[PDB]
Symmetry: none
Subunit: 220 residues, 2 copies
């Protein structure tokens, strides 16, 4: 199943999982983690395009440069920086638009580039992403992880300190980018299987209970 979007029980029934779909769940939760990771596109597109021309960027691939540059369509327009700035200016409706089988012209408008950015996000192979990231993979991949449903309130249930422990155990999770994926999966698996206990606060409370009951019944 594709639900890592399980609001909580992701961290609940994982404990609690036979090695099969635990190794599975960890693996493709990792795959999801990369696949979702934001690339901060503006530098990326500018550095891939330039110094080319409107018709000639639409020529290449690089699927994503194309997917993004299907937005030369709104109106006329290296010169992509121009596009960016000259667009994000207003949230209102100004820039003209094309007509295919019939006129839809004064429309977005402020596309928020969810149009173009999203298009790109759709058109980029994930590996290209891994390479293009190169150790910013840490903050980005972790940053998808943080907005997961399962991770929804962690910061305020467990506190700042527990949350930082988790970030740091995540960055320390993989070195170097070479094995990045294989690394992260590991971490996911090991946290999914038991836990997440501390970094959980309850996990810790329980850990201490059980841990002093086995320094208790040690009688022997």
């Amino acid at each position: 199943g594709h639900m890592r979007l399980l609001s909580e029980d992701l961290f609940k029934q994982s404990p609690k999982l036979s090695e099969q779909e635990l190794d599975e769940l960890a693996n493709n939760l990792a795959d999801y983690l990369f696949q979702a990771a934001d690339i901060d596109w503006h530098q990326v597109i500018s550095e891939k395009t330039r110094g080319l021309t409107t018709e000639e960027m639409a020529k290449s691939e690089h699927r994503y440069v194309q997917a993004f540059c299907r937005e030369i369509l709104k109106y006329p327009d290296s010169v992509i920086d121009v596009a960016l700035k000259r667009l994000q200016t207003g949230r209102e409706r100004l820039f003209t638009t094309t007509d295919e089988k019939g006129n839809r012209e004064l429309k977005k408008g402020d596309a928020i580039l969810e149009s173009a950015i999203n298009a790109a996000r759709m058109a980029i192979s994930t590996e290209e992403k891994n390479t293009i990231l190169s150790n910013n993979v840490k903050s980005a991949t972790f940053e998808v992880f943080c907005e997961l449903p399962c991770m929804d309130g962690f910061a305020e249930q467990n506190g700042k300190t527990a949350f930082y422990a988790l970030r740091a155990g995540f960055y320390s999770a993989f070195k170097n980018t070479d094995t990045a994926k294989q690394d992260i999966t590991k971490f996911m698996k090991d946290n999914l299987q038991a836990g997440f206990s501390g970094y959980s606060y309850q996990g810790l409370t329980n850990r201490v209970a059980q841990l002093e009951a086995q320094l208790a019944a040690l009688s022997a």
Copy 2:
């Protein structure tokens, strides 16, 4: 000293046992002084009635004082004593009654300013008495004065909601019923200052775990 923004918790261990006890003690004392007394949770107390001659006798000094102060107006018929009460919060600004002794007065209303009556009650009260008047409502009040200390400042933000709650509960349970209460809390205080505060603290639950592991492996 109290009011130490951070230090108190971190630097309380280790003060010499005499200094620790001085802190635990003067601390209980503060919690009890600063306790917000919140009258009108006292109205339904022995005003149920009527409830007429109370103000006459009113064994406990606070009712004697308070009432013998609030009896100088018409008492507000035609909606027990409750009717009259309402006329003085929303009475703003009615400017009504209080005939002396002689005539006039005209009046303080105000609705007027009960604050004279509550000044009466609170000046007519001791702190031990306060302990008495609270009655299992002591827990909450004394706690929400304890969170007003500088050391408690960001406690739920660093350690999270769950720990804040465990801390509360642990505090509330610090005392079985009223008899020994001032002592119990003191013991609890001393108890949590000597060591820690460890969990409830996040960091302390961690060290506590790793140390119970170091005792595990240190022996076995």
